[PDB]
Design an enzyme around this catalytic site. Structure first.
Site, PDB file in Angstrom:
ATOM      1  N   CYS A 130       0.798  -1.214   0.000  1.00 61.88           N
ATOM      2  CA  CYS A 130       0.000   0.000   0.000  1.00 61.88           C
ATOM      3  C   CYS A 130       0.834   1.268   0.000  1.00 61.88           C
ATOM      4  CB  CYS A 130      -0.865  -0.095   1.228  1.00 61.88           C
ATOM      5  SG  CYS A 130      -2.340   0.897   1.345  1.00 61.88           S
ATOM      6  N   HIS A 173      -9.654  -4.411  -2.368  1.00 61.25           N
ATOM      7  CA  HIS A 173      -8.738  -3.654  -1.575  1.00 61.25           C
ATOM      8  C   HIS A 173      -9.078  -2.167  -1.719  1.00 61.25           C
ATOM      9  CE1 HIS A 173      -4.487  -2.367  -0.509  1.00 61.25           C
ATOM     10  NE2 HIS A 173      -5.016  -1.312  -1.102  1.00 61.25           N
ATOM     11  N   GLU A 174      -9.312  -1.738  -2.952  1.00 55.86           N
ATOM     12  CA  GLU A 174      -9.779  -0.391  -3.170  1.00 55.86           C
ATOM     13  C   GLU A 174     -11.117  -0.147  -2.411  1.00 55.86           C
ATOM     14  OE1 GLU A 174      -7.492   1.236  -3.574  1.00 55.86           O
ATOM     15  OE2 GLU A 174      -6.145  -0.152  -4.772  1.00 55.86           O
ATOM     16  N   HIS A 177     -10.927   0.675   1.281  1.00 47.97           N
ATOM     17  CA  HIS A 177     -10.405   1.968   1.588  1.00 47.97           C
ATOM     18  C   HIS A 177     -11.530   2.927   1.790  1.00 47.97           C
ATOM     19  CE1 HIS A 177      -6.110   1.714   1.422  1.00 47.97           C
ATOM     20  NE2 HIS A 177      -6.037   1.395   0.151  1.00 47.97           N
TER      21      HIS A 177
HETATM   22 NI    NI Z   1      -4.490   0.583  -0.797  1.00 51.14          NI
END
Ligand code: NI
Ligand code: NI
Ligand code: NI
Ligand code: NI
Ligand code: NI
Ligand code: NI
Ligand code: NI
Ligand code: NI
Length: 203
Positions: A130, A173-174, A177
């Site tokens: 990240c 994963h996006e 966030h």
């Molecule tokens: Ni990320």
């Protein structure tokens, strides 16, 4: 606002626009956006996209001094809105020939969500990375193997879509966030490389 900085026509996004582990924005649940979209939300989607192109082409990556990346969410930019961009290139073959389609997924998505998923779990074998994180963090980050999602693009048209393999990880994963969830939240506390039977490892 941070937003006014990012939308100036001549401003290219770089590492100094990305906030870091501990900024409290990384942990909030992002505000939904509304249509038709404001000029800034439209513009921010493109700057975000343009950043992932830039970060993946070998010389801009060098001019701007960027780490390679395949997705970026507006929270990483101090903007707490539900906007993610994804860009996952296909690779060249052994003979050097470019692939058929450039990308396996190229999209700026507004209000993305997971609407259903597989009962099987998967995890990239090399672990996850990240830009808001400057620690080496080992281990398997356990996600759904397959996802169905909806999202709007910038015209307000609604999209429904199923994904697997690697593209599935990256969107997951996006989306996290924009809910204040970080990847290491899905690494096993006791042993980072514990493998529950049936967990699919992508190599
Ligand atoms: Ni990320
Ligand atoms: Ni900047
Ligand atoms: Ni535009
Ligand atoms: Ni460019
Ligand atoms: Ni080929
Ligand atoms: Ni569920
Ligand atoms: Ni639906
Ligand atoms: Ni359409």
């Amino acid at each position: 606002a941070a937003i006014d900085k990012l939308v100036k026509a001549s401003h290219l996004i770089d590492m100094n626009d990305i906030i870091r582990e501990g900024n409290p924005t990384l942990r909030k649940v992002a505000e939904e956006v509304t249509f038709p979209l404001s000029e800034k939300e439209e513009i921010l989607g493109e700057k975000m996209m343009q950043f992932l192109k830039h970060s993946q082409d070998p010389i801009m990556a060098e001019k701007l001094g960027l780490r390679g990346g395949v997705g970026l969410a507006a929270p990483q930019l101090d903007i707490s809105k539900r906007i993610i961009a994804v860009l996952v290139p296909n690779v060249e073959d052994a003979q050097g020939n470019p692939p058929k389609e450039a990308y396996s997924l190229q999209e700026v998505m507004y209000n993305p969500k997971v609407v259903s998923h597989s009962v099987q779990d998967a995890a990239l074998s090399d672990g996850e990375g990240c830009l808001s994180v400057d620690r080496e963090v080992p281990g398997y980050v356990v996600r759904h193997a397959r996802v169905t999602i909806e999202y709007f693009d910038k015209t307000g048209e609604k999209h429904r879509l199923k994904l697997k393999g690697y593209n599935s990880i990256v969107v997951q994963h996006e989306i996290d966030h924009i809910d204040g969830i970080m990847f290491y939240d899905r690494i096993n506390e006791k042993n980072p490389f514990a493998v529950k039977e049936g967990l699919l490892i992508l190599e």
